[PDB]
Write an enzyme that holds these catalytic residues in place. Structure first.
Site, short mmCIF file in Angstrom:
data_model
loop_
_atom_site.label_atom_id
_atom_site.label_comp_id
_atom_site.label_asym_id
_atom_site.label_seq_id
_atom_site.Cartn_x
_atom_site.Cartn_y
_atom_site.Cartn_z
N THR B 29 0.82 -1.21 0.00
CA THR B 29 0.00 0.00 0.00
C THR B 29 0.86 1.27 0.00
O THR B 29 1.96 1.28 0.54
CB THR B 29 -1.01 0.06 1.19
OG1 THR B 29 -0.55 0.99 2.18
CG2 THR B 29 -1.22 -1.30 1.84
N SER B 30 0.33 2.33 -0.61
CA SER B 30 0.97 3.64 -0.62
C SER B 30 1.18 4.16 0.81
O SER B 30 0.27 4.08 1.64
CB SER B 30 0.11 4.62 -1.43
OG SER B 30 0.76 5.86 -1.62
N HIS B 88 8.34 0.05 3.52
CA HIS B 88 7.78 -1.20 4.04
C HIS B 88 8.92 -2.13 4.45
O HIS B 88 10.07 -1.93 4.05
CB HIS B 88 6.93 -1.89 2.98
CG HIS B 88 5.60 -1.25 2.74
ND1 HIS B 88 4.61 -1.22 3.69
CD2 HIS B 88 5.10 -0.62 1.65
CE1 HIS B 88 3.55 -0.60 3.20
NE2 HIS B 88 3.83 -0.22 1.96
N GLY B 89 8.59 -3.16 5.23
CA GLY B 89 9.59 -4.13 5.65
C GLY B 89 9.08 -5.44 6.21
O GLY B 89 7.89 -5.60 6.47
N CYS B 130 8.14 -1.92 8.94
CA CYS B 130 7.64 -3.13 9.60
C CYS B 130 8.73 -4.19 9.78
O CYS B 130 9.70 -4.24 9.01
CB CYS B 130 6.44 -3.73 8.87
SG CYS B 130 5.14 -2.49 8.65
#
Lengths: 120, 142, 93
Positions: B29-30, B88-89, B130
């Site tokens: 997601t953005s 993100h992660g 994340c």
């Protein structure tokens, strides 16, 4: 912010309020911090009428939340056949996996859903 | 001495990687509000006399390449090094716009034996991402 | 003589191992918000480990998630300081 009001209206199942907000230019692709869209909420709660009007106005059919779940995943969990049918017609990804490796087909087997297994 | 030497001619670099938009196939997601973070970080670290460089929406290949090039610069006149990652992660993983990058791979470029001009100097990696999908329900307090 | 190749690194994670990391759509992530606020206030007063400890407390006590899906609602976050530093770090020398 019309996006917050739309999400709140979709959850409560207020069809009329959803249309009034959309006519005022509310984003059908509005998100909370967890990436939950109006379509996610409508699909989970079985609001067939709101799902259809959202998709009609270009809501993302394959948007996934923070757990990687699409509206098709959430519709499958509850077992609402009609919403599943409508989502697939707008090009819902039958092979989409959440961040726990499950597809819409995988959830239907978990629940023991007889009718949903043949549609998917 | 117990304190890092911080009176070099320059304080050091501050590399900010700001990933907001991601490829559709990735399903990510953005990342709304990350531009606020990037601007806030630039303001903060430049007031701390750091040389700030901001990069937006880099692919996995572009991240590895940026980190290699920076590690091969001459840091001999810099006190420290700062790298901020906004994406993100997963565990041990940061995401480019098109897919995963191994965190150990990025940081290995700056190891004491591979980036000689940063030996004995603090290397700071600030990671907003994340590390899995677990949620903390919390417990009631005073 | 020699120092470890892994020495003098600090990894300041926004969240614990295995856990989600929260962003606010309008104000930005909880971690970076707190980091910048604590650096603006304490960069001239405290050692860096003590600054990041304030960051830990700020994220831990002042933030709670909002969601329209009960799955994601009322959640919490603790950042994770990982230090292989050999010395104290002051920005004011």
């Amino acid at each position: 912010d019309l996006g917050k009001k739309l999400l709140e209206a979709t959850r409560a199942g207020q069809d009329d309020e959803v249309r009034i907000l959309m006519a005022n230019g509310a984003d059908v692709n509005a998100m909370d911090d967890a990436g939950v869209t109006p379509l996610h909420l409508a699909a989970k709660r079985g609001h067939l009428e709101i799902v259809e009007v959202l998709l009609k106005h270009g809501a993302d059919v394959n948007a996934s939340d923070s757990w990687g779940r699409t509206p098709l995943h959430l519709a499958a969990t509850v077992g609402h056949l009609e919403i599943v049918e409508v989502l697939l017609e707008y090009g819902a990804d039958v092979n989409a996996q959440d961040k726990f490796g499950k597809t819409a087909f995988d959830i239907s087997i978990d629940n023991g859903n007889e009718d949903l297994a043949e549609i998917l | 001495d117990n304190s890092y030497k911080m009176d070099y001619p320059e304080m050091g670099l501050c590399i900010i990687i700001n990933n907001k938009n991601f490829h559709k196939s990735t399903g990510m997601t953005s990342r709304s509000g990350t531009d606020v973070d990037a601007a806030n970080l630039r303001e903060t670290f430049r007031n701390l006399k750091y040389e700030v460089r901001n990069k937006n929406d880099l692919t996995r290949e572009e991240i590895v390449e940026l980190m290699r090039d920076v590690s091969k610069e001459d840091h001999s006149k810099r006190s420290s090094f700062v790298c901020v990652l906004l994406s993100h992660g997963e565990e041990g993983i940061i995401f480019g716009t098109n897919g995963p990058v191994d965190l150990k791979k990025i940081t290995n470029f700056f190891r004491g034996d591979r980036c000689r001009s940063l030996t004995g100097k603090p290397k700071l990696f600030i990671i907003q991402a994340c590390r899995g999908t677990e949620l903390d329900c919390g417990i009631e307090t005073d | 003589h020699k120092i470890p190749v892994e020495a003098d690194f600090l990894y300041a994670y926004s969240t614990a191992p295995g856990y989600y990391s929260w962003r606010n759509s309008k104000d930005g992530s909880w971690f970076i918000q707190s980091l910048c606020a604590m650096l603006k206030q304490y960069a001239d007063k405290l050692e860096f480990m003590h600054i990041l400890t304030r960051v830990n407390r700020k994220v831990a006590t002042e933030f709670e998630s909002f969601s329209f899906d009960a799955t994601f609602h009322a959640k919490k976050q603790i950042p994770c300081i990982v230090s292989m530093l050999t010395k104290e770090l002051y920005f004011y020398h």
